[PDB]
Design a protein around this ligand. Structure first.
Ligand SMILES: COc1ccc(/C=C2/C(=O)Oc3cc(O)ccc32)cc1OC
Ligand SMILES: COc1ccc(/C=C2/C(=O)Oc3cc(O)ccc32)cc1OC
Ligand SMILES: [Mg+2]
Ligand SMILES: [Mg+2]
Ligand SMILES: [Zn+2]
Ligand SMILES: [Zn+2]
Lengths: 324, 321
């Protein structure tokens, strides 16, 4: 039976390299709903926060609807992938019992909404084309502000407030953490976020059990920011058959943006020129300048928990390099 | 009959409330149309005059008339005040006609569509505004968005004949200025103004020396921040009306914060407020440290302004028995 196979694939929810694309097929193009549902059951979040199962499904279905299914990369499959990757990074041994159930809920919820209603074009495109989104948000983290606004607003639809039984202060603390995390997914913050993570690794403090010692909001939210940031940039760390399909999708989306940029007489953004692009050189540069400096720093923070993930990234980089 | 009050449009202490009544409740439209014919900005940026009027009229309409303080009069006052802190001798042709243009247009839009309540109120009440802007500079983001949005209505693009890079540069500066009017950034903004003063570099003749952009934009941020917090530096009859209007607006919020069960915001409880102690605390802890630093930066220049401030503070303290 179809849902017998889907249920078997959901046994891998705690594993890096989950067949997220097959789960999309087997779930009827609802990877975000079923992976979020599975993760919430796995972490026992429905009982902890008194989330009615029908409210959760209704919100997750409405949230998945607002991801564009005609956008090749930034869609509900990407959201489900980031949710599940964050869920795995949360289970790393070096972070056992570090985070409260509320912080875990915030990081997973942030991963679910982090790209909702993504139109398939970059912030800079939205700025340069004087979009209504750029006009609303004053050219600052335009997409990321929009993902948050949409993600929270959908909680107000009929039977959609999954946080209805959190206390006032739990509400206020979660909303702030979700905002801080999603705003950190803006790539213009990557360099400063990585520099902060480098500083933390160099001054890393650990408890008598081997668990990372987080002392204040500034350190705890910064780790959660980089965790979701790593999950957002985790495609080159996955098994190659998954990585390659992510590369096909982002190039599909980029090339579309370049066709609109050229039609408009604009300068074509890097990697968006389908007449001058090297898919393979772009992935090597993506790994060398962005993904590997980030994941190698994260692996130091949780050493040695992320050695396999770092090994896969370096193998995949070697493979893409060899195709040139 | 209004035009001779407007002859004062260059002095600290413009009788802006008079101009408001003489203009038919249009102080912003007439004070901007005067400051634009005075700095000759309609030529330099080829602004057709009917287009400028059309924008200012639509801008002024989007300030709420039933809001006691954050209305068009306060906007007209901050425009005119920035306009004079722009004619200070130490800062004279250290800003482009475009940078001048940003600081004035920013002052004009810096509170547009203000509902008369604080950011913290909008956050704590799950308002549509706070939901849109993720609890960060909720009002100021909205002031900018409305101010730019109105440029796109019929015959309102007063920046139509700027070049492409000029429009991008003006937009960036206006955004940086208005976002800096958020009071939650006051302490950071003042420490940076002190730092610029601590290792200031002047010529010796008057003018101050800024080189890059991060410090030239900080000056107009603090400048519009000063003009925003310039009520206690104006003559006492003007200051006292501003005090009546802000406490009126605060008391309405405090009422709506009690018909809700919220913690009453500071100075908003009409049954536990000392209007006079609040003004003295406002001066001691916010207005005077800011204007001392501005007057140091522009030494002397703003000594009449700093004098009037400490006069007004002494008087308000004398109203406390
Ligand atoms: C699977 O490959 C990819 C997956 C995602 C992205 C997305 C990127 C994005 O949205 O903005 C970027 C900006 C940059 O400066 C570099 C990469 C990206 C880029 C990828 O490859 C280039
Ligand atoms: C003329 O007096 C005033 C004029 C304006 C304001 C406005 C203020 C505002 O919007 O947020 C504030 C926060 C503070 O911590 C102190 C003052 C203000 C306050 C005034 O007096 C308190
Ligand atoms: Mg994103
Ligand atoms: Mg304001
Ligand atoms: Zn993403
Ligand atoms: Zn103001």
């Amino acid at each position: 039976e179809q849902e017998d196979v889907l249920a078997k694939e959901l046994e891998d929810v705690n594993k890096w390299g989950l067949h997220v694309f097959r789960i999309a097929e087997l779930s009827g193009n609802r990877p975000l709903t079923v992976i979020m549902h599975t993760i919430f059951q796995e972490r026992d979040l429905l009982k902890t926060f008194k989330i009615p199962v029908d409210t959760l499904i209704t919100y997750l279905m409405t949230l998945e609807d607002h991801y564009h299914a005609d956008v090749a990369y930034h869609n509900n499959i990407h959201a489900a992938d980031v949710v599940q990757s964050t869920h795995v990074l949360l289970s790393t041994p070096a972070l056992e019992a570090v985070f409260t159930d509320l912080e875990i809920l915030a990081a997973i919820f942030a991963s679910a909404i982090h790209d909702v209603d993504h139109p398939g074009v970059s912030n800079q495109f939205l700025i340069n084309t004087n979009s209504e989104l750029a006009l609303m948000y004053n050219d600052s983290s335009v997409l990321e502000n929009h993902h948050l606004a949409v993600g929270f607003k959908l909680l107000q639809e009929e039977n959609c407030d999954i946080f209805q039984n959190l206390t006032k202060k739990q509400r206020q603390s979660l909303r702030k953490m979700v905002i801080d995390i999603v705003l950190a997914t803006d790539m213009s913050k990557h360099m400063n976020l990585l520099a902060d993570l480098k500083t933390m690794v160099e001054t890393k403090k650990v408890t008598s059990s081997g668990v990372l010692l987080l002392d204040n909001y500034s350190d705890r939210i910064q780790v959660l920011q980089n965790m979701v940031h790593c999950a957002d940039l985790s495609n080159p760390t996955k098994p190659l058959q998954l990585y390659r399909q992510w590369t096909d999708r982002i190039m599909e989306e980029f090339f579309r943006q370049g066709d609109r940029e050229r039609e408009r007489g604009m300068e074509i953004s890097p990697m968006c020129d389908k007449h001058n692009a090297s898919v393979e050189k772009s992935q090597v540069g993506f790994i060398d300048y962005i993904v590997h400096p980030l994941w190698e720093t994260w692996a130091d923070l949780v050493h040695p928990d992320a050695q396999d993930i770092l090994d896969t990234l370096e193998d995949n980089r070697e493979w893409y390099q060899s195709t040139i």
